[PDB]
Amino acid sequence: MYGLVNKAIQDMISKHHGEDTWEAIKQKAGLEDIDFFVGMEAYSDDVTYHLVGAASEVLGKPAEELLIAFGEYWVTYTSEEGYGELLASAGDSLPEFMENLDNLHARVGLSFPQLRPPAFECQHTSSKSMELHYQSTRAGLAPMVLGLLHGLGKRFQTKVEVTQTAFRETGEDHDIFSIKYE
Amino acid sequence: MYGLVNKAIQDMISKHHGEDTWEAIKQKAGLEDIDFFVGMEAYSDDVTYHLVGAASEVLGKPAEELLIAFGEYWVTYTSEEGYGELLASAGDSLPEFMENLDNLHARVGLSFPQLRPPAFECQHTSSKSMELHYQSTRAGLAPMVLGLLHGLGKRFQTKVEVTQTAFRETGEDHDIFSIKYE
Ligand code: HEM
Ligand code: HEM
């Protein structure tokens, strides 16, 4: 993935758990010789997976838990590190934002040519609920999607309840989320 | 399962969709010949499963979402229908409630002698997170647990973020959930 993602991981853990802890994760992940991640360069997905693993072993939290936290963190990070205008343009409510999400990533992909973005489709089942379908080239990011949804809930001062109802990991076609909102 | 569970399914579907909707579901489950469920009497699990599957078909929604909504409904149902004191005694917080859940189900077991309760163990990864291990004699109730946890979220005015990280339905030992909370 693009170094932006790894910068953001680094950023979250350094603020929440300090630099000594990050140094350890950096060491344990096998990236002692990398001074900094370059935001607009594309790294192997391995680098992100080894960071999450090393972070899980250092922090003693399951990877999937850190994915939830990093999903939420990513909504604040992107607003503050040069994509706040783009975020705001994607909508004024949780449901409008999710409808616009493929569009946002298309806009991102102009400037990030090696982007493998996620594919999102919304089924609106009421004015307070929807089914969100998530398709990806990558596995195991469903917990991150859950965190992102809660961050968008906080962003739009909106109560939100998310439950994953279909699991690629369990042999369904693709990840599906049932979402309820104010 | 004990009749209380099927009473609550009936009570949920009746309250949100009307008795004709329920009467349709009742019929297609093969349970035309049951006037009412006896709460403190044990039934075959078959009954609940047919009720879920019939209710899925009649309402036009996946069985998972019905288990999720029912899981939430149960926390409200138990408070009203004779187990509010017991609910209250089991805790002042979400993480405390889950630690007391096996003891709650043992207390229930005094009065319901053929209870096959769930087993829940908490591994607290921080003051705001846990790994919840759910063990059961039955398959397929994982979605209901998400619902239950959302009900407990509302009971205690607590924001809850849940992904399931391991699946009893596959070669893994039992269902695990990663949870973050206020
Ligand atoms: C300004 C806002 C955003 C920017 C600039 C952005 C950019 C990106 C970038 C660069 C990646 C890495 C893809 C790669 O390296 O191939 C990515 C991945 C992802 N983004 Fe965003 N994103 C934004 C907002 C969102 C939001 C709000 C969500 C909410 C669900 C979202 C969901 C994802 C997901 C799920 C992935 C993982 C890709 C996959 O499944 O394969 N993004 N995004
Ligand atoms: C407060 C009062 C409660 C009562 C009286 C109660 C009682 C019961 C009863 C009677 C059953 C059916 C088991 C059988 O028929 O063999 C059951 C099952 C179950 N209860 Fe509760 N319960 C309560 C609260 C909770 C809560 C708060 C949760 C939250 C997670 C929970 C989780 C479950 C689960 C998962 C099952 C399914 C059993 C299985 O996995 O095999 N219960 N409970």
Whether A150 sits inside 8 A of B159 (CB atoms) is yes
Query: What three-state secondary structure class fits A157?
Result: coil
Nearest to B178 among A60, A62, A178 (CB): A62
* b/e per residue A115-150 (b: at least 16 CB within 10 A): eeebebebeeeeeeebbbbbebeeeebbbbbbbbbb
Extract the annotated binding site of B.
2, 74, 105, 116, 134, 136, 138
Contact indicator for A177, A131 with CB cutoff of 8 Å: yes
Contact indicator for A64, B130 with CB cutoff of 8 Å: no
Q: Name the one residue in this structure whose structure tokens are 């407990």.
A: B152
Contact indicator for A41, A1 with CB cutoff of 8 Å: no
A71: domain range? 1-182
| H-run or E-run covering A16 | helix A3-17
Task: For the beta carbon of residue A66, count every other beta carbon within 10 angstroms.
Answer: 26
Whether A167 sits inside 8 A of B164 (CB atoms) is yes
Instruction: Compute the distance from residue B72 Cα to the ligand 1 centre, in Å.
Output: 31
Would you give the DSSP letter of residue B40? T
According to DSSP, the β-strands at A160-166 and A175-181 are antiparallel
* b/e per residue A165-179 (b: at least 16 CB within 10 A): bbbbbeeeeebbbbb
Query: What three-state secondary structure class fits A122?
Result: strand
Determined by: X-ray
Angle at B87 between CA B83 and CA B89, to 5 degrees: 115
Instruction: Compute the distance from residue B130 Cα to the ligand 2 centre, in Å.
Output: 20
Ligand 2 pocket, Cβ-based, cut-off 6 angstroms = B 1-2, 4-5, 75, 78, 83, 86-87, 101, 108, 112, 115-118, 136-138, 141, 145, 148
Task: For the beta carbon of residue A44, count every other beta carbon within 10 angstroms.
Answer: 9
SS3 track for A53-108: HHHHHHHCCCHHHHHHHHHHHHHHHHHHCCCHHHHHHCCCCHHHHHHCHHHHHHHH
Structural tokens at position A48: 């992100």
CB burial of residue B106 (10 Å; 0-12, 13-18, 19+): exposed
The residue among A65, A157, A164, A179 with the most chain B CBs within 10 A of its CB, best to mutate, is: A65
Question: Structurally, how many domains does chain A consist of?
Answer: 1
Q: Name the one residue in this structure whose structure tokens are 């607003």.
A: A79
Contact indicator for B168, B139 with CB cutoff of 8 Å: yes
Structural tokens at position B5: 């569970």
Q: Name the one residue in this structure whose structure tokens are 């096959």.
A: B116
Closest by alpha carbon to B63, among B71, B73, B53?
Answer: B53
Domain at B145, CATH number: 3.90.1520.10
Query: What three-state secondary structure class fits B117?
Result: coil
Whether A163 sits inside 8 A of B180 (CB atoms) is no
Ligand 1 pocket, Cβ-based, cut-off 6 angstroms = A 1-2, 4-5, 78, 83, 86-87, 101, 104, 108, 112, 115-118, 136-138, 141, 144-145, 148
- Between CA A7 and CA B129 the distance in angstroms is 24
